[PDB]
Amino acid sequence: EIPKEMLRAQTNAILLNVLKQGDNYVYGIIKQVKEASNGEMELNEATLYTIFKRLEKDGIISSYWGDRRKYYRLTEIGHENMRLVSESWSRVDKIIENLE
Amino acid sequence: EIPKEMLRAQTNAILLNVLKQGDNYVYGIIKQVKEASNGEMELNEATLYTIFKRLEKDGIISSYWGDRRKYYRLTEIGHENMRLVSESWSRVDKIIENLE
Incomplete structure (x- = not known):
């Protein structure tokens, strides 16, 4: 199994990259990451908060x-x-x- | 500055990948990562331990x-x-x- 530290690091990097593309709100970010991952990564609201x-x-x-x-x-x-x-x-x- | 968690996650991933290429010893791993990073990443022995x-x-x-x-x-x-x-x-x- 993947270390939780590693998963967190990846999530952090992806979220910062989304915001680099432009200001955004939680549901909008979730949608963009779901699309960019081809359905693979469905982030949870509470994780983003x-x-x-x-x-x-x-x-x-x-x-x-x-x-x-x-x-x-x-x-x-x-x-x-x-x-x-x-x-x-x-x-x-x-x-x-x-x-x- | 890069979060220490992120740097650790990257180091972990690189070291596991080195060992995937074959069994190895600390100085040998340092050498291989220095080469593969074009001099950029000089890992410390104590970090590997x-x-x-x-x-x-x-x-x-x-x-x-x-x-x-x-x-x-x-x-x-x-x-x-x-x-x-x-x-x-x-x-x-x-x-x-x-x-x-």
């Missing part, structure tokens, strides 16, 4: 109300964290390909 | 002496864990590509 609480506390994202619906955005510094995260994950992929 | 302690405790790998040098191997069940881990990481990559 846990993760976003941490990311908001850390200043990586912030929230705001729409026209009552909560939208999330990467912060200015969150965009930097996203860039470093993206680079590290691309680096992993390149390492794995060389090892095979 | 921490990780392998956990993986051995969990029954994912085991150790044995060479002809004194410690070699590590994926266990029978470790190979299953490797397969599930590999699938989840490939799945992440496909999700990220669809999101972009």
Whole structure:
């Protein structure tokens, strides 16, 4: 079985990437990840609220109300964290390909 | 900055993949990961001993002496864990590509 730490890391990376594509709300993110995973990954609302609480506390994202619906955005510094995260994950992929 | 949980997850995945290529010893693994990362990732010996302690405790790998040098191997069940881990990481990559 996959370590829970690993699953959490993957979920974090995917959610940050969704918000990089644009500000979004929980149900909208779930829909986008379900589609992008071809049905494979159906995230739970409560899982996102846990993760976003941490990311908001850390200043990586912030929230705001729409026209009552909560939208999330990467912060200015969150965009930097996203860039470093993206680079590290691309680096992993390149390492794995060389090892095979 | 990258969450330590994320870095740990990536390191775990890379090390399991190295052992999938064959049984190996700490310095040998460090060398292989340095090469496969084009110099970018120089793992520390003590980092590997921490990780392998956990993986051995969990029954994912085991150790044995060479002809004194410690070699590590994926266990029978470790190979299953490797397969599930590999699938989840490939799945992440496909999700990220669809999101972009």
